[PDB]
Structure formats: C-alpha cells, structure tokens
C-alpha cells in the first residue's frame, strides 16, 4: 500500500510504503515515517487524529468496518454526514473522514490529508 501524506504543515507531500492490515493503524505508519498527525489520547474518544482519506485507485476500494466508537467520535466532531453513515452501515464503504488512530491500512493507494489541528476545528 502507498500512502501519500499531505498537510499545510508539511513542506512536501510524503510517499510511504506500508504493510496492510497491521495492528498499527496509520498512526504507527505516520510516527515511523515522521509525519506529525496530532494524537492526543490513548483510548480513541478524541477527534485529534482526524484525517481526510481519498482512495486514489477508485476501483480498488476495500470493504471495512466502521466501529461504533469511531462513528460516534466522527459524529461528535461533525465529519460524518447522514449519507456517509448510511453508506458505511449498509454497503460497508469507508467515509471520507477517518480517525488516524483507528484506521487500518488496506492494500490500496491512499491520500491522507490533515491540517495539524484537532478534529473539531
């Protein structure tokens, strides 16, 4: 899997090769490769590691489980519209906004964008 980290803080987007399905959840990848996503909790109930993930392959998007913890955190932050929640619940497709501490890397090309700010704003 190829992950392209982009952010206003980063001078350039960073291309990273990652192993799919590891217990490290794309935070581990960011911390290994020096990408600084704000992670400020250890349970998963804050929104700091909020990122926007774009599937660059389009025809290679994998099915995933949107856990109730991540769904509730995204709804508390306000980055989970009703349509995307319904799509995740019914068709098992990931939403556009994810939490970088709970997102398991899949075997595809992804563009991860963050603002260096907590999830809420």
């Amino acid at each position: 899997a190829t992950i392209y980290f982009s952010s206003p803080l980063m001078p350039h987007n960073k291309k990273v090769q990652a192993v799919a399905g590891k217990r490290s959840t794309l935070l581990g990848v960011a911390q290994e490769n020096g990408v600084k996503i704000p992670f400020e909790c250890q349970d998963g109930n804050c929104g700091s590691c909020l990122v926007k993930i774009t599937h660059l392959d389009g025809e290679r998007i994998k099915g995933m489980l949107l856990t109730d913890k991540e769904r509730n955190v995204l709804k508390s932050v306000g980055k989970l519209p009703k349509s995307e929640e319904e799509r995740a619940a019914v068709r098992d497709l990931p939403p556009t906004y994810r939490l970088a501490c709970q997102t398991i890397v899949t075997d595809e090309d992804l563009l991860v964008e963050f603002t260096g700010e907590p999830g809420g704003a």
């Binding site: 217990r23 998963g44 856990t67 501490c101």
Partner: protein, 522 residues
C-alpha cells in the same frame, strides 16, 4: 426429472443422462480441465515411493492436520463442571466453530459464549468486551461459574485476563465472590489436548491455591480422577462404574457426561450434572490424584504435586488388558479396597474374547492416528492381540512420547516393523499407506478420504477405515462407545474382528469367482 413416488436426492439424481450431459458440456466448454490422461498420470505419481520422499520433506506446509486448537479442549474442560459457562475471550468465529464441531460430534447442544471482539478491540484491547460479556452472561444465562479461555487473537494482543477480571469485579459488573477462573490457551502452542490441561490447571488454581493451609492429604478418604480430553461418554461411565463396583470413594473432576447427554423430554437444560465447586475445594483432602491420560496432563500433574502435595502415581491410560490391570492394582493399593470378583470375571471374559478371535487378528497390519495417550493405549492393545501397527502417527506428539511408544514396541515381537511419526499429518499417512499398504486404518472421520484415495488406485489397494477416535461425523451415536477398561477393550476387539470379517466377506462375495471362500461359519 422427479417422480412423486420415487424422489431422488443429490444421489443418484445427478447420475441421470441429462445431468451427465450438462456436466460434460460445462467441463468441456468452460472449466478448462486438464486431460484425463494427465490426471491419471499425476494420481499414479502420488502413489509412488518417489512422491513419499518429497512429501516427507515438507517443512512449512501442513495438509489435512490431525489436531485442533487449545480453546476447544478448554471449552470441553469448562463444560466438565457444574453450571459452568465456557467464555472465550476473543473473536466470535472461534466459538461458532467450536460449537459446530462439538454439535457434529456429540449431536447434543453445546453452550459457549464469546466477547465478540472486533477491530476496535484489536487496537485498544478487550477489557470493556470482558466486562460487558461477563455482566451479560451472568444476567442472561445465570451460571454459577464462568470459565474464561482465550483465542489466538487475545494471546497475540497480550490481553491480561487476571487484570481484566479483577477490574471487572471491582467496577461492579459482577459480584466479588462470583467464581471466574481463567486460563491462557494460545492456539499456536500445542493442540486441543493442551487447552484442556491449561483450563483444568487454571480452575484448580482458582479453587485451591488460596486455601491449602487447612488441607490434610487423606481427610475425605477419596481418590481424585482427572479424565482429560475425553470424547466418549462410555469412558466416563465405565471409569465410575468400575470404581463403584470396587467400593472406592471417588470424585470425578470435570465430568461432562451428563451435560453432553440429556434426555429429550420437552424441555431444554443448558446445564446438567458436572463437578460441583465443593468437590473442587475438597480435592486437596483426597488420598491421591490419578490422571487417566498422563501425556497431556503434565501441567496439571505439576500443580497437583507441587501444591496439593499428592504423589500422583505413574500410570498409563487404562486401555487394554495389562494397563487396566495396573490401574486397578494401583487404585486398590491407594484406597486399600480389594479388587472385587465382578471385575476378575470381566477380565476373564475379556481374555476369553481375545482367545476366541485370535485367529483373525494375528498378523493384521494397522495404521493408526489420534491423541498421544489414546494412540499409545491402542498400540499396546494391538500388540496384546498379535497385530502389527506398522504405521503410528500423532500430529500433536512430542519426542518423549515417541520414545515411550518405541520402548513399548521394542518389548514385543509384533512391534518390529512399526514406525512412529510425530508432527506428521494425514497426507503423510496417505503416502505411507500407498507405499507400505496396511490392512486397515484406525482413526477419526478424516481418514475416509484416504480410503477413497486407495480405492481409486484399485480394489486390491483399498485400505478400509475403522472409526475410533475424535471427531466422528459420518456415523451416528458412536460417541456413546467405550475405550477405557475391560468393557472398552471388549468393544474395540469386537469392532476390529467384525471389520476384518466384513472386509473378508466383501472380498469373497463374487459368485463363481471368489465365493468358494464364502463360509457361513467364519
């Protein structure tokens, strides 16, 4: 087409001409199947001695294993106790597979629960799953004890069961006096028999470790019996009937015979019988503890010797004549009760049965496989009958067990061509029976395909399968059989001799070709 008076199921409906034509068209047009000559060449190549040499050089590939994972045995051991709910801390597919396996083997309901751990539990641990599962399980099914095992997810994650349960009791999810024994049962270490040992050791720890100060060895004048991973209700019943006839006071720890066999009388009983918690608390007060299957109860032996201070006698599994005699003599020595006449007569009847059927069993070559204790007991009994166990296999075996089995074989002329294998699967056994053909096979239901492989080569190369072991799926109610003691020896002898006679009858039924040997009296 179907006829309203002669309805045909999948066999032999698909043998009709229209179905044959449809399948032939499918295969010719779209399957891109290899030519039948290539298939026949490859199949004959697999039966050669050259293929066996490549097969036995396998180091990373396992084909048709002959073992399961630890939590299966852990679940069985948990079911062994009274009002005990097996609770597997991990993903929920494991519990479904365990229940399906045990339902297909015993054809009786099996009750187990899970924490239904998921991707959030893989990242942040499964402590909340543990708390909620314990609370829900105690509230809904109302058990008197919850016995916690682990899958391979919880072990790889590194979930601390003791911490999770202690934090669950102090938080108020379950009362502090509610017994929740736990055990770590990694599925990548050992097999299903090891999980039974770990679960029993954990339960014994939970019930006896903190109260050994006021325990005196011999207070209740009883003997503890630890059966192990046993999948024959007849073994549980015979191991209690023999002691009851003997007059010995006994306490069967982990007895699942009652829950795994309940009457069909209009009501469903989730719990039945089982060892009570009082028996587990009083276990250290017993005269001595006997492990029926000592080759997978090693950790339990360590705990019993170190903590309970009981000097566990070194006995073999009560399979056969000599080992049953040794077991009875050791029990008589421990309890002081003389062996009654009702067991000497049974031994004499078994010897009479052996003498009557020795002319058909002598010189027969058998290939066997299964659990270490069961396999070694079966090998000893076969040696007592004059048979030749040419191929001996035990996937979940160690080198000390192999050395013991070799020592047993060397102490008998018939154990001359025998070869013991450990770490080998059923594909190795298929290769072995094709090149060194035995006369029969003794194993679980997974050995039927091997027989089908031997028939394809030819009727003269077919190796019939005798179903003794676990699991048995293609036969009904064989789990009620017995393999321990004299009664089990009688049943095994009957099965072996009747399988031999049935095969002989099948080979000599062709009229005017081989039916001259179709003797009425055989």
């Amino acid at each position: 087409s179907q006829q309203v008076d002669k309805i045909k199921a999948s066999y032999p409906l698909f043998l009709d001409q229209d179905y044959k034509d449809m399948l032939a068209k499918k295969r010719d047009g779209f399957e891109e199947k290899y030519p039948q000559d290539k298939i026949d060449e490859v199949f004959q190549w697999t039966t050669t001695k050259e293929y066996q040499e490549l097969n036995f050089q396998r180091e990373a590939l396992t084909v048709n294993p002959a073992k399961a994972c630890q939590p299966l045995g852990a679940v069985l051991c948990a079911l062994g106790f009274e009002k005990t709910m097996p609770y597997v801390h991990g993903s929920q597919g494991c519990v479904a597979y365990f229940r399906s396996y045990f339902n297909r083997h015993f054809r009786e309901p099996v009750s187990c629960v899970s924490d239904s751990m998921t991707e959030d539990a893989a990242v942040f641990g499964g402590q909340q799953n543990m708390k909620d599962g314990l609370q829900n399980c105690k509230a809904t099914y109302k058990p008197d004890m919850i016995a916690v095992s682990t899958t391979c997810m919880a072990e790889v994650i590194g979930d601390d069961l003791n911490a999770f349960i202690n934090n669950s009791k102090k938080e108020g999810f379950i009362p502090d006096e509610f017994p929740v024994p736990f055990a770590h049962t990694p599925s990548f270490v050992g097999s299903h028999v090891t999980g039974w040992d770990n679960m029993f050791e954990g339960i014994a720890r939970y019930f006896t470790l903190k109260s050994m100060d006021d325990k005196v060895v011999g207070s209740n004048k009883k003997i503890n019996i630890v059966p192990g991973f046993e999948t024959y209700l007849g073994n549980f019943r015979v191991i209690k009937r023999m002691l009851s006839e003997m007059g010995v006071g006994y306490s069967l720890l982990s007895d699942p015979e009652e829950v795994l066999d309940t009457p069909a009388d209009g009501q469903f009983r989730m719990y039945a019988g089982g060892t009570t918690q009082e028996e587990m608390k009083d276990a250290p007060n017993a005269l001595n503890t006997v492990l029926l299957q000592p080759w997978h109860l090693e950790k339990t032996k360590k705990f019993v010797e170190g903590t309970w201070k009981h000097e566990v006698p070194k006995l073999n599994i009560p399979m056969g004549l000599d080992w049953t005699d040794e077991f009875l003599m050791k029990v008589s020595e421990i309890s002081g009760q003389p062996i009654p006449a009702s067991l000497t007569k049974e031994r004499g009847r078994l010897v009479d049965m052996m003498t009557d059927s020795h002319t058909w069993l002598h010189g027969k070559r058998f290939a066997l496989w299964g659990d270490p204790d069961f396999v070694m007991g079966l090998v000893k009994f076969l040696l007592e009958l004059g048979c030749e166990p040419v191929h001996i296999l035990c996937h979940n075996g160690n080198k000390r067990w192999k050395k013991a089995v070799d020592a047993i074989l060397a102490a008998s002329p018939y154990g001359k061509n025998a070869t013991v294998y450990i770490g080998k699967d059923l594909w190795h056994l298929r290769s072995l029976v094709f090149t060194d053909k035995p006369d029969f096979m003794i194993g679980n239901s997974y050995g039927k395909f091997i027989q089908r492989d031997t028939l394809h080569k030819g009727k003269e190369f077919e190796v019939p399968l005798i179903r003794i072991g676990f699991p048995i799926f293609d036969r009904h109610h064989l789990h009620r059989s017995t393999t321990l003691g004299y009664e089990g020896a009688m049943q095994i002898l009957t099965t072996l001799v009747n399988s031999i006679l049935e095969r002989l009858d099948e080979e000599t039924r062709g009229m005017q070709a081989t039916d001259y040997n179709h003797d009425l009296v055989r």
